[PDB]
Subunit: 509 residues, 4 copies
């Protein structure tokens, strides 16, 4: 997938693509002038013997002291070497890549004052599929992607290590792989590379994509459970949704009618489609899932903007010759988006679990008192029904927001931070919880529909049944179930059901 990048125009779709697979990129020519221009600004500042913080001053107490021009190259290197004090397991190549591409997009907007040749270097590591070692922990989402970003730049200066073809090489052997040589940095270039919200942004983005995949899956899964228990379609009537006027819900109901259709053999084979009321977990799916869609749409907007943001410091405005110190490196926005996404992920998992319970019960579904065929011979999946409770419950605590916490770092000058990295990181596990839950819904609904011998559900829903059944057989009775769940989870993770959702509903899809 070749991209000709025009900085700051990244869409969430492209971001999905970048997160998902290898990317080949090159810059758009419209890019060259602003980048090159911001460098000449920095360059003339130096030459006019002027002194500017972030450009040619020292740091802290010395933030006021000029650094010998020839002293400047060692500053960079000291900055990079010093900040790589992260901790944890190393990010998978996917996230690295994404972060690499986000930093590139960001620098290339020509507000950062670093040479194109340095940007060009990053791009070359991207194109070569060489991914610098980045550890999961250390950043508080304020003062630049500081460790993760430092760990990234290490390889550029022939330091640290990088992964290639799944093997750890040296920052040197790997630079060569990319057709490069160890690089030396100039004024501002140290602060340009190490500062930004890219790490936290990639974390939050992965969570959004995850939240997105679960959403889609949940519409297919909730559609089967409606059928499995011979539920109504009336809860999906467009008019009820337009009368509430909630868009998330409006679009969600629409998605539901699309997948279920006006009726099915299954649905048609039950006298009427009204009688007894359906339980909230069925009936209020548009409302709840609808609320969830809104949530993930709000975050997506914030995150869509941040992915193209000029997030370093200080920023250089070559047109006016100004260099300004701000705080764009503060990822509060991103943190809140991550926290936002937590609620949607949890509540999708919550609703699916109650549908599982419904299904297993001696009614809430209208099938076997457990699906199997007697609580006394065996006792089917009342149990997988327990596993989903355990996963759903977890997400309740994981929902605790991180954007409200903060610790005064490095001498109460850095007296308020975001915690965006942790806000976002936790969504990944939250999505695993919700994914196992749905998988169990998926397996349960298909088991149940199965019991309704020879009957068929909607066209999209029969596709969802077949997707499962292509890899997991009907579990009609006593035998080790864990491996069914395990398999269902994978298919979900491979986006098995994603294609059934109508297009343009989800931000990145």
């Amino acid at each position: 997938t070749e991209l000709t990048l025009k900085p700051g125009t990244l869409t969430l779709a492209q971001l999905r693509a970048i997160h998902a697979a290898p990317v080949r990129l090159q810059l758009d020519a419209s890019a060259a002038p602003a980048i090159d221009a911001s460098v000449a600004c920095v360059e003339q500042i130096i030459a006019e013997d002027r002194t500017a913080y972030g450009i040619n001053t020292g740091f802290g107490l010395l933030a006021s002291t000029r650094i010998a021009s020839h002293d400047l190259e060692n500053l960079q290197r000291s900055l990079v070497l010093s900040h790589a004090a992260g901790i944890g397991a190393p990010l998978d190549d996917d996230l690295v890549r994404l972060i690499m591409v986000l930093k590139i997009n960001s620098l290339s907007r020509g507000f950062s004052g670093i040479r194109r040749k340095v940007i060009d270097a990053l791009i070359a590591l991207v194109n070569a599929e060489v991914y610098p070692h980045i550890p999961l922990k250390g950043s508080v989402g304020a003062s630049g992607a500081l460790a993760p970003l430092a760990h990234m730049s290490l390889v550029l200066l022939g330091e640290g290590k990088a992964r290639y073809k799944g093997q750890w090489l040296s920052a040197t052997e790997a630079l060569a792989v990319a057709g490069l040589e160890p690089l030396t940095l100039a004024a501002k270039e140290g602060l340009a590379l190490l500062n930004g919200t890219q790490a936290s942004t990639a974390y939050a983005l992965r969570g959004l994509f995850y939240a997105e995949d679960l959403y889609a899956a949940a519409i297919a899964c909730g559609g089967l459970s409606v059928e499995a228990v011979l539920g109504s379609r009336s809860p999906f009537d467009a008019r009820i949704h337009e009368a509430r006027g909630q868009r998330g819900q409006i679009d969600t109901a629409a998605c539901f009618r699309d997948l279920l259709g006006d009726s099915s053999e299954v649905s048609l084979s039950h006298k009427n489609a009204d009688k007894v009321q359906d339980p909230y977990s069925l009936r209020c799916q548009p409302q709840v899932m609808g609320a969830c869609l809104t949530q993930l749409r709000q975050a997506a907007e914030v995150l869509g903007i941040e992915a193209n943001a000029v997030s370093d410091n200080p920023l250089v405005f070559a047109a006016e010759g100004d260099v300004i110190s701000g705080g764009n490196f503060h990822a509060e926005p991103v943190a809140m988006a991550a926290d936002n996404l937590a609620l949607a992920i949890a509540e999708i998992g919550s609703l699916s679990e109650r549908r599982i319970s419904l299904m297993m019960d001696k009614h809430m579904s209208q099938l076997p008192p457990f699906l199997v065929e007697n609580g006394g011979v065996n006792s089917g999946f009342m149990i997988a029904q327990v596993t989903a409770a355990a996963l759903a419950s977890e997400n309740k605590a994981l929902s605790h927001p991180h954007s409200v916490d903060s610790l005064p770092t490095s001498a109460n000058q850095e007296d308020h931070v975001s915690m965006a990295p942790a806000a976002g990181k936790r969504l990944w596990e939250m999505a695993e919880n919700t994914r196992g839950v749905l998988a169990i819904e998926w397996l349960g609904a298909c088991q149940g529909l199965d019991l309704r011998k020879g009957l068929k559900t909607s066209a999209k829903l029969e596709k969802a049944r077949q997707a499962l059944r292509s890899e997991v057989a009907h579990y009609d009775r006593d035998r080790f179930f864990a491996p069914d769940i395990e398999k269902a989870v994978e298919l979900l993770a491979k986006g098995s059901l994603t294609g059934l959702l109508p297009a343009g509903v989800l931000p990145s899809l």
Copy 2:
């Protein structure tokens, strides 16, 4: 303030007005046809001997059993009498009113099948300033505003009690005050009155308004602290914000430049406006407060929509002659908005506290090591600086989201609920925490600027100084401070500083 209501067109401003003070309303004539029409639909259903759930069936197991037409009037009354099982202190007249006006707006959209004369009754209690007894607790944000809504309708049937001129009268003496008589209800009218998201919506709305008032105040307060410590204005440079591309932050910075202006006597009296970097708590105000503005804007949209929503069940579509049972009574959306608003309220309080700390410190401000004049003679407000820490910390726990919790009610048919009432209720206390924090910032900044003898800050900021000083004197030293805070809180609560913020920034303002 007279309003001629056109149902479902309520703006957040009008809602602010309704929440804030007595409202006189009447319906717009364009209203009459749909309302009257939905009634005739219900009415013809009855007459054609047809039986429809929510209209003329029983409930639960009997949800399938027709109720003798003449039996129907007692159903209503039984519904109302039965659901008023709430708990807690009674809502203040303000919230009652708001809820009353939201239910009225909702019913009048003519999807609810209840007589105009019943709507007219509600409106008359509004116009008369007669507020039925509603207790704070009982609702789970699903199955209709059920208790609070039941407690409301009680007065209509000459039951319960209502508050008038701050006194509890009987639902009878109070009905009369409104020029009314006890009412009898007809088919569907019981479910129309008791079902809806109005209670939770009013709770969340009050929180939004609160969050809004704090925001504004926080821009004035953060502006004074910048001055108090001779901070920079460069962090507010429009260009840095447009380069990030975040709107919340863009608008926030703009608000800051508006209040501070390019410079002040105070600011002008300090050699330069660059030198040492400002601490995050100063520098990253656009970023953080900007993130907060976004948050409260997202919720406002959801809540703005819900205030005009047709939230009862089942809904009647007279044009097609259809009566449909959905789940619009599920307040998931509202719950998430409330949870959303929690983060903004907390983080506004968080940033203000670190500014207080900065100010009290032997620097972070550039004034007295505590503001007073020596930690050894007395020791000023290092302490009020402690009180703000206690209030800020609280909001960290209060931020725990309620929209992720749910309990299966009334026999796992109501197997998923929202918890919207609690999500929203908790914001009120959260705003008190943040308001005390800011008050202390307000008092501190004015104390500090004071110390800079005879110097003046911006025009809007001098207005903020004077607003304080008009009621709270300079606290130049040893004497009981609590009463300063107490006073500052009130002024804040009376919206003292709200008028300084530029117009059209905040949803309801």
Copy 3:
């Protein structure tokens, strides 16, 4: 109730008594020597021209500078005047009193270096039922009960205000009421009065007592629901509990067998007492309530110790002539106890709610599908069953611990604090949630047993039925229920059911 206090020997029972009602106290003569002795130590330090921090140094930067002896009296007064920067509503007389008695107990251990005449003053305000104004907020549980304690001492120096006979008098008119005159303080006496963990300790203690009252009530209530639904007694078999070896549970089961007895008319009237298994919410009561008892016993121990603790600074050891600065003013222990107690309170509320649900369901009880007599005529308390869900759910968020939060105060010298005040304060509301829940259980079980015409439960349980029925009639059908709950709550709050629990189970009882 006259007490002759021997400092540091307070029991939790006496503390319950002090919290619960007016106390008359006087010191034990064994007290005089250590108190008087610590004063003479301070006094000789002064006279030997020695200089000691906390005794005769300044504060902060000046913590190293000696204060003119004649300057010392104004230090006290400055300390008191300065720290009273609290916020919130004023504590009820009960809590004030308790705090007053805890500070008295503490000082009197003769480690604090303050005159008996000053202690004597406090005691006189206690004996006279004069309660100084203390606001709920401001303290972070570290650096002395600082504001609340300052607000307390205000009255002593003829400042602030005090409540007497429920009226706010002046610290002067109120001092006189106590037979006193405004007092002047000496070296160390300022730090002795304002520093300590008494405020947080009283907060946590009130929560413990609350948690205690709920526990007892929950054994009576859970006993009725077992009967109401014709549950088994076998889950209470001593042998099952001794086999687990958990003491909390062992004692809890014992309490259950005591209240239910081997059998009842009710229980005897059902063929057997085995058949179908009982649901966890019945069967696992010893286990869950047992876990809860342990929790509240652990906290009680910590809190029992803290109530007698010498918590000021610095401390004076007259025997060796030493004055030492420590940090006993850090209430971490208390904070954790408060957080501890949160889990017990929540989980008691949680189990009671599921018993309500069980009862309302068309089984889980064996009575009316809702208790009333048809979901279709009326529909009874399926609803009060909703109110309990709302109260139970709240406690889930309120359980979020405060002892994990901390903010660096007054210049990172006070860089770690406890947050004990908030940890404890929140339990009070948590107990209201759980109390409403139980009240609803209480009312429901009695309603249900009622339906079993003319049948009787255990002797203690019939007492519990009668306690209710003495004030709340059988609610056999359609009519306003809220007022039933309201009434039940009160009785619970008046400890109505507390006397049925066997003695010596609960720490303070």
Copy 4:
């Protein structure tokens, strides 16, 4: 390490040993009679044609229906096969082993009615170092260790897979390795193996051990930082601690005096040991760490008891010939212990972080404004100081308790559960956060003391310096730090500093 097990006498030390390394065990002869006896009870129940739930009834609706005696062997197998519906990664051999040994201890108390030959089988898999596949997720801590326990028993019946010499074999090849053959089960044996609190108990135990290791480490680390910044020893004066009367704190102070001694070259080289007050993070170490010790001691007691508990159902009392159904399988106690331990782990991490901050600051330590040697040349570890903030902050959210959550499983008969597995699982990550924090403290203090050329600290503390320096060199300046942290973490994880703490302080140590 050979053990001759006398059931239910396990100590926490032995449990530490079992968790930590391979165990060889055999039963004590005193064991044989009760085990064998409970079997004959079950056996005679069968033979007398009597029917008993859990023994020879069906399940659920059929819980009342007798199972053909010859039908019974297939019941077991169906039970096992059915409940293995867990999810997640497989537990490490350590935890498996521990769980295996806990179930063995439990069954062997002869209340479970299963043959010794079946117990003997488990023991043989333990002795052979063959560890059945157990996935991390699925259990809600109620209804028996159900999935994890089912997954365990799978191998016994020649199903599933087991790990041996770090390789996954078949339950068959692995049974053989243990010298076994696939087993068939009899009455009650299915419920005896699958039911219990062992899984959650092992999870919580690992957390306790972790919490224990961190505690010790934190005393050594906090001792070095006191020295690094030339802090006082007076805060550790026994008298201050006895005056508070808190035991945790009393023992903690004692531990501190033991490690620091009355004085050191370092301490001796600073004029006095009083002057300026130390910051809370130093001074209040006994108080905070003391509160933490209490917390972990409380949990340990509960967990110590649970490890020896008879936790299955129903239980058999051969002496009286009774078979009783209780609910000992409800792990509420364990859940609360796990939640309890969370607070200690967090607060240990919290205090260490503020000590790091202190150290890095241009004071709070008295060393380099960052440790390195100028914020302007390089800038040392102000950064690792950031990494610790990120880890400490995480633990704030992870502290959210799981014992307050619950979901009604398998048809509201299982209407209240514990969530003990998740309460405990989360402590492991929480300990990683706190361990990285301390590691960074460790590295920082040693770096700082280093700067005090040629000076020495206490004898135990010099051992702690050397432990580090044996593997991590002084990091005197600019170069990649991450690998220092990485290394320090490992040493901590290998219990490097554990041996310095005086004996008998910690429950398991």
